[PDB]
Amino acid sequence: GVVRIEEGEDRLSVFVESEGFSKEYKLPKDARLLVKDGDYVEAGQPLTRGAIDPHQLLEAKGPEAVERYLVDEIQKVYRAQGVKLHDKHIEIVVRQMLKYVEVTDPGDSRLLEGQVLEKWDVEALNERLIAEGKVPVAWKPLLMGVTKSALSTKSWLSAASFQNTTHVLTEAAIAGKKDELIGLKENVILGRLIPAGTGSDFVRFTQVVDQRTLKAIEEARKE
């Protein structure tokens, strides 16, 4: 919308009045604003100056949006110190920061239980396609941070290692709760052959042949 500041050396604030709703945007008596007296806008943006809250933003502006800020933001300091580094990296991190979403109008699980994107769609693109009906089971924009993050990761073996394991197992144990061992910290706590590189699913299930020892293996097949 539009704007207009009011008073000087007593009660500071500002107002974001579009057409009708004049949102009372205060200031603690010591703020360094920068969007003068008149200006013009669009949704969720740096008004005062200072910072940019994660959650508060998101909510009223979307998930990607934050992401963008995130990384970049982060980068800004890194850059300010000689740091160089493909952005990609920082991104990848971020990714999980989204991974979870809350719920409303469900078609199967609890009416809140935080949740994984994919899990939401192999179930929200599967309760309207082959198994039509029930309810799409929508979600919303949810933000975790490394910390809060991991913690809700479905896997437990890994899930342990943090805060107070008790809890994790506790609840877990109760319902079946499986893992699938898809991850690193996962397959390692146990000491498997990591689902990576050599221990992946595309370059380890390969059997090598030696040109001549392929014709002593071609006469024991047509028998």
């Binding site: 197992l169 144990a173 499986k178 690193l184 390692v188 706590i189 146990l190 000491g191 498997r192 052959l193 990591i194 990576a196 590189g197 050599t198 221990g199 992946s200 380890r204």
Partner: protein, 1114 residues
Amino acid sequence: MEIKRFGRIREVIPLPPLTEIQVESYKKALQADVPPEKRENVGIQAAFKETFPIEEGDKGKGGLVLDFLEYRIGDPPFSQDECREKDLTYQAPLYARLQLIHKDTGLIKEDEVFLGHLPLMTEDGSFIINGADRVIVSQIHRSPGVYFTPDPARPGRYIASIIPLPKRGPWIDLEVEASGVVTMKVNKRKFPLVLLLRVLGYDQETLVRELSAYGDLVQGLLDEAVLAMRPEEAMVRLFTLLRPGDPPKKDKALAYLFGLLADPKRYDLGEAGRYKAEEKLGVGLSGRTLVRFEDGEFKDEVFLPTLRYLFALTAGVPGHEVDDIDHLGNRRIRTVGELMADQFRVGLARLARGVRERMVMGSPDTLTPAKLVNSRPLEAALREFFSRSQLSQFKDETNPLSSLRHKRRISALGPGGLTRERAGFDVRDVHRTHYGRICPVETPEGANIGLITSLAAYARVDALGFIRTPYRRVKNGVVTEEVVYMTASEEDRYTIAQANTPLEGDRIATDRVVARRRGEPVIVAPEEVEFMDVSPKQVFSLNTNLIPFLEHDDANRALMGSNMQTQAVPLIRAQAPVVMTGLEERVVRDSLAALYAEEDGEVVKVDGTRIAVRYEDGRLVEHPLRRYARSNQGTAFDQRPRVRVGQRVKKGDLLADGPASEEGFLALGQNVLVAIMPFDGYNFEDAIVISEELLKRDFYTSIHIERYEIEARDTKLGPERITRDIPHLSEAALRDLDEEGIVRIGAEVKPGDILVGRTSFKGEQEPSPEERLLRSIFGEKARDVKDTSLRVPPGEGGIVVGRLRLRRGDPGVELKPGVREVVRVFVAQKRKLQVGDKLANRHGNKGVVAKILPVEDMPHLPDGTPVDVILNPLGVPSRMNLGQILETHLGLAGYFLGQRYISPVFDGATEPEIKELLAEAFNLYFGKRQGEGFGVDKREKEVLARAEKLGLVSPGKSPEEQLKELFDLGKVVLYDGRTGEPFEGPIVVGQMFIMKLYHMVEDKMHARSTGPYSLITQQPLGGKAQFGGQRFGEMEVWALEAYGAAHTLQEMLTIKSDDIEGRNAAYQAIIKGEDVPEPSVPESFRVLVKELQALALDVQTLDEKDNPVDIFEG
């Protein structure tokens, strides 16, 4: 040799008797040499007296009391040397004279009642606690008083402070919050402070009077008209909220600590606590937070004048400002003698409740002191002190300096009154105060940096631990001789001037004078002067002074040097730095590791084993020379005869040197000839090259004595003897154990070879797998009594030279619970240099070696003689330690010039002064060459040929000159022994003093293909025969993860640690050479699953089709 000394400014006074921080502090605590009726308090006195007019529950009625009169000092049950070989605390019985009057009367004075072993100090400054020596250090805490300061979790508002001496009074904080109130925090308690204003006689209109009108915070502290009531009533809402479990009106039994007397509250006798809480507060206070028994009630003294500077601080006027909580005039120092005395208010503590419970059960007539006291709480609590507190440190005996360095230390850490390992960014930092009190370039690299540190040379601690630093007084333009030792709070109001500043005869010389005030650096008028420092040494730490050209070194890469100089290890043919700073000699004397003579006489008998003299008709002492004894790091210091068998002496001069000393002068390392430059990346990044030459001369060699020990216990399977008789051992083995179990002295040691046999029965079981494959590596199956002898641990070793024996029962030999008979063999070794060994300069250029090169390589000068160490340049730039480069110059100087010099702190020589001798050396050096008949050759000129094109040389001048010109320019031409052609650029060369540090690869370095598998965790640990067992952390893995290192990861989590199956399996595997591993399912996995069920929860296992596993097959 012949010594010149630079700069003047004559030290009006040598330096403090150093070791003063431990001796001069500990003697004025335990006054056993001063009539007992005398003694002006503190230490044991003020400790026996703070807790001695010790009554008995019930005031007046039933008798029983017990008081004090004087304390008797003990006499060493043992001598310094024995109490050490025998593992004793070199304590010293301490008796006290008690007498307890009854209610019916009786003057029964039980003649000295043993209270506990109080350890006597040493000439050194350390002690003898359970064997070795420790350094009861000196901490530094917040000096008592009141300052206030702002609020932390609430900006804009202010909190008040009331700190009395610690361990003699509660912590008190008057923080004003948002509720309007001014609550009172005390020993973990936050109640409405209005409840303590009324207890000290304050109404509902005099709390609004002296402190309202301004700051309407008094109308939050006010409306609570349910507690603005009665005097002995605001005492039960205070004794029913401060101490639950007891609601009696005996709320002046507990509310009797935190105030009157000195049981708890009080900040010194009226010093820092009062003299400070007077000038900044509301003037006038004697000695405790208010006062009780005055006429009836409590007549407040210091809970209102400080509540009249904290609220006039949250609005207020001038004069009322925050205090700096890290200022020295605001900071204290707990010396030695007092820290044991405080473990006496704690040694006399659990003892004033070991009698007040003994006069309730036992007849009150049948009582006489020495029958009421057990005296275990001063032994167990004053032995607990020299045996465990984070402050009672080992003692760095590397060299003698460190020894002392240690002492000088200052810690913040501490038992209770101290600082944890997670704070301090308002303290750690160096403060505008320190100047001359606490050096700023001595603290440790990281982890601790700040909190810990060494005192600033001259500076002395005094009275209530106030650091005092020496200044010289003037008559406003003139210059006195009088010198002013003064505290900091006594310095923030004087306009002091550098000593660096020009002074004629004995006064001021010039009008542009540099001076400081409080802390700010300004220029001042010649008579606008108060004082003037005694010198700069007054400014830097003790060792931070040994620095030669500090005047030209970064501040950072410097401490490194003062430091490191500590991790300095001695060598034989030691030698003191060519360039010194004077003190250089003194350090050696105050350390005491060197031997001097009290009175002047003359020597008669003289050998490595002793030195007999015949002082001036003062008899004939005969002090022995500790020969090759072990340090604590291992080191191995030994004094050495340095006098003749016939000569009048000099009133006590080097009666013979110490470890790393040369005729009275500190010889940390060995000044050697260096060549600054790059070699085939053979000093790269921070490496250094050496010339075989030193090994030849055996120049950098260290002696070291490793201490081995053993313990034989008493068991059910039988007692653990120790005889030169142990089965299957083939005589050629025992071969050197004449002692009947011990190795003879002078025996050459190897590894695995026997050191101390020791047979224990054990058994009752049968071997099996995972040790019967090894086993025969440790048995041949067996015996009814096993080997378990000592044997030399991998790598170490050397030539023996010392054996000690004990046995549960000797006079003073006391063995723990279960043990019997001890033994300790002492074997040492020569160590020369070994590629990789560590070494550096005082100038912070730490640098190890990678290539010892033959005297055939080793870029040599033109006159044949080769350099020694190549000190690449690169390591100098990014760091700012010029000076070192300056030492090299003076070096070449001091070479041909034949001498030593002393470039003290900011008083050293100078470029113009040095060029002087440098040329003075060239005129000589070259006079030597032309004199021989030569005079520069193609090689040289060719250099000078470019030396000019480079402008370092003045063009248009004979070759010869371009040399001197250059020579004086501190460099010269250098020949690369390998190729006749010299380097193409003059080279800075010279004699650089260096050193050998604590670290020496020899003690690091390991490798294990297999070996000792733990039995606990099921993996590689310890190491009897073969050794080591490297660790592996997450990082490692993650990265491992980084690469698709699959197996490299898995093989790194199995057959190389837990999974017992594998390690053997694998181990075998190679013995034949097969693929080798492929472990079934990693140990740990199963373990856990089982540690799981071993706590409920199945913890099953399925695949892709979700089906039952078979995870354990057994």
